[PDB]
Amino acid sequence: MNYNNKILVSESGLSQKHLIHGDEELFQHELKTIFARNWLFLTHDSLIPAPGDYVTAKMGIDEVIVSRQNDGSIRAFLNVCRHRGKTLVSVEAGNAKGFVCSYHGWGFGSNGELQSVPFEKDLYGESLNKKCLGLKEVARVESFHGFIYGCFDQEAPPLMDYLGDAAWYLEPMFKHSGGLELVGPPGKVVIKANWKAPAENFVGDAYHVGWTHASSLRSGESIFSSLAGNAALPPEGAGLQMTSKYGSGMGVLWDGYSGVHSADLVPELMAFGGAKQERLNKEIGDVRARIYRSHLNCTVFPNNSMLTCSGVFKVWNPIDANTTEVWTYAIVEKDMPEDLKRRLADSVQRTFGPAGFWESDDNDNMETASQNGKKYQSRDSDLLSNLGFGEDVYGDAVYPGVVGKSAIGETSYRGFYRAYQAHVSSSNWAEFEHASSTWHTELTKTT
Amino acid sequence: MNYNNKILVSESGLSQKHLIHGDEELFQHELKTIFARNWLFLTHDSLIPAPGDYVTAKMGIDEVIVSRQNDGSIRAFLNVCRHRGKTLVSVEAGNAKGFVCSYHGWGFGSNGELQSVPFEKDLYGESLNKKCLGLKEVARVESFHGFIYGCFDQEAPPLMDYLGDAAWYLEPMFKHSGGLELVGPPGKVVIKANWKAPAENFVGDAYHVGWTHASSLRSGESIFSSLAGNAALPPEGAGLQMTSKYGSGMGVLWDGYSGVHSADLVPELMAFGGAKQERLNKEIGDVRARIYRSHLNCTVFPNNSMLTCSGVFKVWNPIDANTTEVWTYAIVEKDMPEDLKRRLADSVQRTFGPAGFWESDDNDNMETASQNGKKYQSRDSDLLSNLGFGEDVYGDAVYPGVVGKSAIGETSYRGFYRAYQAHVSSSNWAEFEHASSTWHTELTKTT
Amino acid sequence: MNYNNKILVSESGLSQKHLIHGDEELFQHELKTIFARNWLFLTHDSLIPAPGDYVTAKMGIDEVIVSRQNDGSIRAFLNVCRHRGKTLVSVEAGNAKGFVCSYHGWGFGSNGELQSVPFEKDLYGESLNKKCLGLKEVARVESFHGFIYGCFDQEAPPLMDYLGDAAWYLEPMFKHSGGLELVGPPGKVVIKANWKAPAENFVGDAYHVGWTHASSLRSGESIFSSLAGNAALPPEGAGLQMTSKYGSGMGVLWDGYSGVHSADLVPELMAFGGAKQERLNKEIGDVRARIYRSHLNCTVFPNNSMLTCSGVFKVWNPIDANTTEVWTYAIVEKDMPEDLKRRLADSVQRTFGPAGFWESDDNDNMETASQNGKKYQSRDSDLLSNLGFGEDVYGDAVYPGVVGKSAIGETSYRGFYRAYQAHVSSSNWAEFEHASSTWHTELTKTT
Amino acid sequence: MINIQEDKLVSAHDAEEILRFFNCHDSALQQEATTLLTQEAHLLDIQAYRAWLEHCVGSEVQYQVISRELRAASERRYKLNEAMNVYNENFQQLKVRVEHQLDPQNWGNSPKLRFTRFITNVQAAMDVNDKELLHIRSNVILHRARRGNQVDVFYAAREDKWKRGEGGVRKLVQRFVDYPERILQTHNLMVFL
Amino acid sequence: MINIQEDKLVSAHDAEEILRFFNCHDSALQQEATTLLTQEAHLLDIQAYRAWLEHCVGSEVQYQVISRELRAASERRYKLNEAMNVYNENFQQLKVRVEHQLDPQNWGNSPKLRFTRFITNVQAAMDVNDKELLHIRSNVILHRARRGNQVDVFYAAREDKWKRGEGGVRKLVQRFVDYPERILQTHNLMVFL
Amino acid sequence: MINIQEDKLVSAHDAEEILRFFNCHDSALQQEATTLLTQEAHLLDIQAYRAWLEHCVGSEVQYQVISRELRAASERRYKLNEAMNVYNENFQQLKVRVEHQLDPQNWGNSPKLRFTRFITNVQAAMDVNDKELLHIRSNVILHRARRGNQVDVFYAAREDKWKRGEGGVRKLVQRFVDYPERILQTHNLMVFL
Ligand code: FES
Ligand code: FES
Ligand code: FES
Numbered sequence A, B, C: 001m002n003y004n005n006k007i008l009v010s011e012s013g014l015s016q017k018h019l020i021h022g023d024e025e026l027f028q029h030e031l032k033t034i035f036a037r038n039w040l041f042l043t044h045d046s047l048i049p050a051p052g053d054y055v056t057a058k059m060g061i062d063e064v065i066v067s068r069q070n071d072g073s074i075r076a077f078l079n080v081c082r083h084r085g086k087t088l089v090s091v092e093a094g095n096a097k098g099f100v101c102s103y104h105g106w107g108f109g110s111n112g113e114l115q116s117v118p119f120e121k122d123l124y125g126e127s128l129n130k131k132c133l134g135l136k137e138v139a140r141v142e143s144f145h146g147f148i149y150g151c152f153d154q155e156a157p158p159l160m161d162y163l164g165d166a167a168w169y170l171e172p173m174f175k176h177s178g179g180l181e182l183v184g185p186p187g188k189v190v191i192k193a194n195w196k197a198p199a200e201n202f203v204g205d206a207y208h209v210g211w212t213h214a215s216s217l218r219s220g221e222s223i224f225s226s227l228a229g230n231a232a233l234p235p236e237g238a239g240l241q242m243t244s245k246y247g248s249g250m251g252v253l254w255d256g257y258s259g260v261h262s263a264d265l266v267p268e269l270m271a272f273g274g275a276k277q278e279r280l281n282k283e284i285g286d287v288r289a290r291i292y293r294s295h296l297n298c299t300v301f302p303n304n305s306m307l308t309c310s311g312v313f314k315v316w317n318p319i320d321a322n323t324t325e326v327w328t329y330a331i332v333e334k335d336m337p338e339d340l341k342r343r344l345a346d347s348v349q350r351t352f353g354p355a356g357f358w359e360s361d362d363n364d365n366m367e368t369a370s371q372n373g374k375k376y377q378s379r380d381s382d383l384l385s386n387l388g389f390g391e392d393v394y395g396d397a398v399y400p401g402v403v404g405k406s407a408i409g410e411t412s413y414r415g416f417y418r419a420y421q422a423h424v425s426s427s428n429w430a431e432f433e434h435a436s437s438t439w440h441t442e443l444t445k446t447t
Numbered sequence D, E, F: 001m002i003n004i005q006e007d008k009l010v011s012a013h014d015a016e017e018i019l020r021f022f023n024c025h026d027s028a029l030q031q032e033a034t035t036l037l038t039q040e041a042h043l044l045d046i047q048a049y050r051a052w053l054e055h056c057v058g059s060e061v062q063y064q065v066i067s068r069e070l071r072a073a074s075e076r077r078y079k080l081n082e083a084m085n086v087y088n089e090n091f092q093q094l095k096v097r098v099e100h101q102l103d104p105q106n107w108g109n110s111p112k113l114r115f116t117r118f119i120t121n122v123q124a125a126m127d128v129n130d131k132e133l134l135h136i137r138s139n140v141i142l143h144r145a146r147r148g149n150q151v152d153v154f155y156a157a158r159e160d161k162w163k164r165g166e167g168g169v170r171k172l173v174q175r176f177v178d179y180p181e182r183i184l185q186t187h188n189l190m191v192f193l
């Protein structure tokens, strides 16, 4: 398949070829043009706060060691020994000043430098140039209010610019709330689905909530209980959808601070968020303060997703076209009381973790939609994302980005897939930029 | 591999390259040139007799919903939602006027039409053209005396013509007996073999019976018991072999109405079939009436097989080059007494079902012959099907088709593989026809 | 990938691309250019000593029957029936004058000839040319002091020449000791590693011993106990490394006759080997007699490895790029007392067999180094084998081959990978010879 | 103890069966049943099929294993055959299968198969009317290994009826298994559960 | 009986637990516990979730399953959360999950799932202080089959506490499971271990 | 009870073993054996290897696991070694393996492994001549999880001999396992069955 010419996503992101969820050759091509080129979630400051603290993380199918340096910075390295290629670290987290390879004993520092080689003088004499034998390093590592992302491509935009118009929406919760923390360790489960399936569902799919999660809504008595079985349609102005130049996007559901949490947490949360919203009114204004206590279902392109307020934080780690490793963390506001923090963490896993009764509603949707992408008669079929097309705007006085002034629609799919086509048909960042010079015009065409 | 030039089957179907049972690229090419182009078994009227009755079925690796319409006709659709591609129906059979997708709630009718979309007016307004969003439909669905076959290719021959010369042989049992019924549900088992292995074995392999099934013959006391261990060779004129232009073919074993069934059923069956054979003598003649009570091991090209009289009905569903999903049903004569019907059904599964002691004799044969097709030194080796070559005739006064007037031979392999080469080197039906203009001359060459 | 141009191994075998341990296309290409072209271990005379004795063995991914003929010779055949390609023999060893296929009953002799075909006269008449229907035969089968190797390529060098300079090192133990025997049956385990990983480790990796096997050394009280945790560096002149034109090579550790065996065997072994070394001094000289009682870690290109003295004998059978079937036998000196023979066999399996506590130390090393070869960021990385480069010699007065006069180094890796590049970029034996006309100059470049 | 109008996922049959065991508060019968099943599994595991027939199986036995068609939880109109019989054997039919297993020309039995069976969760209760009839419920994990690298594992619940016939030996008179995997991924179901 | 300074791979917790069972040399309690667990597994296997709640689960229950982060054997400085809760439920939370299972719009439950549970290695000992509190240890293999060809098998050790509340019925008051597979290869862990 | 001339698939050894258990109609011994094995499995599962050695294993132990070569059912001429020893250990050899497991530089043991063992089908019978010698048969399913996504499951039948030595503690004096899978698909067989 010629990825320069093949139309995998139609104009304005209206449709995608079903094969994108199933084709292994395209998966291989994504490793290069999506995962090696874009920003990927690694960890949070709260997970490696002290010098020598490290976690392992996936970046595409590659595994990296993410380590807090003595100077307080964070560096990330391929989890691979520079001698004969053994995996260096076999744990998920810990603290250390270095890492020793259990094959031949080479010793690497937390800064990736080759520090020691057993009996170096007697074996290598002076021949070994250690300065050139440090761990392969991740070129770019940047932070967004404590959230750490990595990128293998030096030519990428800074993380902030990469977030584009989505940044404005996240800031109230990520910045103005006084800061978030990530509660680990994460739940880890393998699903038989393409990474794009859950990515697209979290980026702009409020339409499925009432029906897919009918049973969970009915059972939990969460603030969205009505909506179960599509019994009620959310009111006019219940929220909006936005998307952005580099693919990130989100749905906004006004005031839903208790989110997916069951009646046992709703009073406390709704009280906590409201109290903060009052204080924030003076600092960032009413609209932005409201956004803070509003439920955001967002995907940070390409494979990091979250539900603010619900506090669900997800990494969709790619294995192959129909295999994904799901990592689930809980996000909490630092100034929440500890007991509330612990209960929120448990509730996040209770709903969306390995045994999450909500996440289970989604399994078959994701797996079969992905698996059907390999079926002969379906490879060339068109997946539809045209809901709300021709009513999106750009450059609004209040809400930035390409915006659909409605709670339910497919705006965020369109922006997600627009950035995806551009990347897959591009050899580098400059070409993606050229392919994206009229992005917002493309998304609002008929408006 | 250039499938236009590659000789996968030698002239006259004398030999096949062992790689056909193992090559994944060829498997992929078969999806297009065998499974998407030819007639495939779906179900039987007796399985969906009432309006709204449906079953799911495989057509290649695709899954379809096969539904009885209100007007009494049958239509079949891809089991895939037209929105984001989720699998629509998750059961094997039932009754309903429509199907609702559990992802976003789109409602399809049993006629495949998009009937309802949740909150269509508020979300899509008038923009959604539902008439264009019905389930992808199987172009051709036809019946052969209650047996329902589907074909994705509109240019195909009608089913009757597709059956060609094999139709004459099947008619006495399928038509003149007063009709057959299919007893479900079927047994379903995955074997590690290429779909062609069991297809070729059922189409023309009486040679393996005495030896492969030695233990089953000895143990069951069926009408073919002698023959166990190749202890006896069937008498001169014990039967024949036939094949046809579009690949279907069968072996005929004179008078074996009790077939593989154990002594407990032989008296009743042999009495039942004889009684009917007497009545049929006046209606269709002695020869044809005999064919009725004669054991036919047949394959309807490409992957549907059966043993009449024994009542074994098989679908060899393809998964990959060394993986096949075997479906086993029982076929019974409608006018048989119910108690006989139930006992025959059990005996079919007892012998050839998931725990069928006869079918188990075949497992290793099929699996290793298929698996050896991937082995380096064997890919380019030639599988032989030359037994009886140069003694087949065409245009006989009594027995139509390309015919080997002998119970044991490889005539049916030759015709099967002749049609297979023609299809794989052809881009469409017109080219297959051109490649088949001297088919019978090719098969009888040296006669 | 163009294997004519792609540099998979740098000049002088200094580095290899990590992808060689992970690429499936390269694996497929190795089937042709490594496994179908080179000498592969089949069995030992002691395993099939009597006429009609046979074993099955792998040659690449192909399976062959290896049978002792009446005239005392050994012939080997593809374990595949010449009719429809079923696997002929389903056991690992036995005795028989022929083999009958359980599909249709064709009978083959131990000499591979098609001897009988059921009811041949009545079915085939005279048409079947049996002389042309014998089992596909392995072209070359040769012996090295009872050890039997096979080669599919007729153009190969005789086994002795193939062993090249490594032969001299093996002769004292394989020839002058009065002969070795192979104790079966072998242990059989599947590891998730590329066949080259254990092949390279056994051919020249003494560097990993102190560190990888720290726990085993400490626990067993074997003659190399000191060395555990790299606590001590072996003395100057503790041994050497050699490699050869066709890829075979080995490490030599002076006097280590008790090898990996635990204190319970050290006294007896050290006594037994010394006694023989005294007798051999007069026959083959002091140096060669010492080599006999010295520990050799050797790989016979491409995938047969051994530790003399320890008595470990391994076949690394390829399945796919990250899957290998490990066969483990014990080698013993024929003139050892039986009770010592039995205890040595048990100790070989105790240390290096399926539950071998030493072999287990190596598992993760092999599996991850192989698995990392598939990871995107690591495919194009360079595995290093430059230790001791520029100090190897060729044409030494005492020790033949390309030789590193040091116990620990990477000489044998270099020669192994030099022969591997040459084969993979070559279409036949003549081209490999041309690509190897300055092999030893290439390996000693900077010396 | 179950109300199936409230416990909506529970079949009437299943509710019937669990009532029969919550009230046979009877330890010795439980141990007898355990012994019976362990001995049956052992004979089966060593492939002593004739012994099994002679010592464990009653002349009036019904040995049944079904594969149930996957239908909608809410299905109420479609009434055609819900299941097929993988096994549905009388003593004679079992004898045929045993002969088929013992026959020297059963090529699939060379080299010899390896079976290993694990019987757990044993419950026992006497029948209300036939005082000589014992109901026994147990679960089985059956492991079959053959030809180097073929490995199949089967899982199931067994509903048995055992009766003392003659010799006082308690023998199997009915075994019923609703096999839990609709599509077998084990080559065949040719084993005695 | 364990010295953890010598048995270096043994956790203090594990050593504590094994001490509690090497000295409840008490056969009848073992049989009672066996019965309790077999009945619990049976009700679960037939999906009688309301019955399970009413008859097997105490109002003060803590139903907990954790996934422990993989750390170095020699780790001693890193002290952040070692584990997350796959389950950590009180009676009400369990009731919500049960309702979620029974709901007619749980699309994942059609067609009906098939569960088969195997309970083994049962040990029982009374608590030292609360004479009404029974400690029960057991291992479970849980087999789930759905949708033709989906098959998931779960393995775990269970540390339980059971108490007679009212009706004299012994009910579950605490279940603790440290799930042994860090990354689940089973789609989800949505089953009651 | 078996006639091996008629039950053609049955080995003489297997027939010998089953005779020894059809006549130790002895419930208390069965329960003692059950307890012994469950405690042994528990200590093993928590990796208390020194405890296992001290409390469960006799000084005269032979701990043996074999892998039998696949031969023709009708084989009668080929008489070379039929099997190899995956394990064939005396007490000292077991101690070495235990030390190897406990060693801080066993890199394969970090992060810590997770074992879960299921023991079923327990049968017990005293030996005819040595009244202090107990024969115990049981089947084991052994589950090993490591490094996130590595999962190996082992299945086997165990033929044991246990003797009261000193302290009156019954200890293991012989374990014999004929491993049923010829080619292991589990990376290694480095576990104590
Ligand atoms: S592979 Fe890491 S030290 Fe050699
Ligand atoms: S995928 Fe079917 S309604 Fe959306
Ligand atoms: S395949 Fe061997 S006789 Fe036919």
Ligand SMILES: [Fe+3]
Binding pocket: A201, A208, A209, A212, A213, A358, A361, A362
């Ligand atoms: Fe959802």
Ligand SMILES: [Fe+3]
Binding pocket: B201, B208, B209, B212, B213, B358, B361, B362
């Ligand atoms: Fe057959």
Ligand SMILES: [Fe+3]
Binding pocket: C201, C208, C209, C212, C213, C358, C361, C362
């Ligand atoms: Fe090693």
